[PDB]
């Protein structure tokens, strides 16, 4: 599914993402925007290290989900990477929360540092009623 901006903002809020571990909804929106264009079936194989990024937040298989084909990987979210390719983002949200419980927080995603960190992200949630 390709979410529309405000539709996604409310979906995330409903799933408890607003201010989760101090991360505003606008930040999560900026992440999803740059990671996948709000696309849940988005995928990216990393030929360099044999891992694959999955879903709306482009979560990596080396440490977060199991796809069975990434060498010496871990499954911190205890989910099949397939769960991150669903139209329903509940599982992706649970995993995204798992990611930020670690030291780096929202900084785990380099795209966030590149396109959201120290930026004006107010625009991502404006007019959405969140």
UniProtKB/Swiss-Prot annotation:
Tell whether Secreted is among the UniProt keywords.
Answer: yes
Q: Is Secreted one of the keywords?
A: yes
Pfam families under this entry? Lys (PF00062)
Enzyme Commission numbers on file: 3.2.1.17
| Assembly and oligomerization | Monomer.
**Further details from the record:** Lysozyme C is capable of both hydrolysis and transglycosylation; it also shows a slight esterase activity. It acts rapidly on both peptide-substituted and unsubstituted peptidoglycan, and slowly on chitin oligosaccharides.
Q: What is this protein called?
A: Lysozyme C
* Species this protein is from: Homo sapiens
């Amino acid at each position: 599914k390709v979410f529309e901006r405000c539709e996604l903002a409310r979906t995330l809020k409903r799933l408890g993402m607003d201010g989760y571990r101090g991360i505003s909804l606008a930040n999560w929106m900026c992440l999803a925007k740059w990671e996948s264009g709000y696309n849940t079936r988005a995928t990216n194989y990393n030929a360099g290290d044999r891992s694959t990024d999955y879903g709306i937040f482009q979560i990596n298989s080396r440490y977060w989900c199991n796809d069975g084909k990434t060498p010496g990987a871990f499954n911190a979210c205890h989910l099949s990477c397939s769960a991150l390719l669903q139209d329903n983002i509940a599982d992706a949200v649970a995993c995204a929360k798992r990611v930020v419980r670690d030291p780096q927080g929202i900084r785990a995603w380099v795209a966030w540092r590149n396109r959201c960190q120290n930026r004006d992200v107010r625009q991502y949630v404006q007019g959405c009623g969140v």
